[PDB]
Swiss-Prot record:
This is Green fluorescent protein. Changing I165L: In R10-3; matures to the red-emitting state with excitation and emission maxima at 555 and 585 nm, respectively. Monomer. Changing T197 to H/W/F: Results in significantly red-shifted excitation and emission maxima. Changing M147T: Increases fluorescence at warmer temperatures such as 37 degrees Celsius. Changing Q63L: In RSGFP4; increases fluorescence and shifts the major exitation peak to 489-490 nm. Changing Q63M: In Citrinine; leads to excitation and emission peaks of 516 and 529 nm, respectively. Changing V218R: In Azurite; shifts the excitation and emission spectra to shorter wavelengths and increases quantum yields compared to BFP. It comes from Aequorea victoria (Water jellyfish).
Length: 226
């Protein structure tokens, strides 16, 4: 439901992770203002040092906060599934390295939008850009393509993240994503389109824990018909 999102809504994020056996947990919190496609979040690794670079988990850590222009409202699958929510699953293939498989439930719990995640990563090279922490602490702007998948009453999403490497090169991370409603009510299955997202990463100067502050703007685009 769109109106659930007309103002600022609190967000909670919980991630339980295991990559090549390094177990870690992260908690996040912040707010989303979909009117402006704006998210402001802070994440903390609560199990010590984060075993993979922060930027690699950005996409894992709430597309219901995208700003869908009015003329695109009927294509907003994400809001349409709330408040009961949707399950979001991905496989993220890091080029020439291992991969992440994640499963999440994004739904309201009270007046808070919560994204609860499980991530397992495998086949990472002990010394590659990921486990070797060679990725820079920045993020590029990307387009996220969305298509309906009527069979599963959800959408399929595909995009490739370009993570800057410390050498000047780029580590690609190919995202295969699927979302399905948790509820039984009808949800909106959209026509193809995309989301344009900009992400800013920073640090909280008062925090001793390994953490990440993330501010993002995300907007839907691509449809001028109907």
């Amino acid at each position: 439901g769109e109106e659930l999102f007309t103002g600022v809504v609190p967000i909670l994020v919980e991630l339980d992770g295991d990559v090549n056996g390094h177990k870690f947990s992260v908690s996040g919190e912040g707010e989303g203002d979909a009117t402006y496609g704006k998210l402001t979040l802070k994440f903390i690794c609560t199990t010590g040092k984060l075993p993979v670079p922060w930027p690699t988990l950005v996409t894992t850590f709430v597309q219901c906060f995208s700003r869908y222009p009015d003329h695109m409202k009927r294509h907003d699958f994400f809001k349409s599934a709330m408040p009961e929510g949707y399950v979001q699953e991905r496989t993220i293939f890091f080029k020439d390295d291992g991969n992440y498989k994640t499963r999440a439930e994004v739904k309201f719990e009270g007046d808070t939008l919560v994204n609860r995640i499980e991530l397992k990563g495998i086949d990472f090279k002990e010394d590659g850009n990921i486990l070797g922490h060679k990725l820079e602490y920045n993020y590029n702007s990307h387009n996220v393509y969305i298509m309906a998948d009527k069979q599963k009453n959800g959408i399929k999403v595909n995009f490739k993240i370009r993570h800057n490497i410390e050498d000047g090169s780029v580590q690609l991370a190919d995202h295969y994503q699927q979302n399905t409603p948790i509820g039984d009510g009808p949800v909106l299955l959209p026509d193809n389109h995309y989301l344009s997202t900009q992400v800013a990463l920073s640090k909280d100067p008062n925090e001793k824990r390994d953490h990440m502050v993330l501010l993002e703007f995300v907007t839907a685009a691509g449809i001028t018909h109907g």
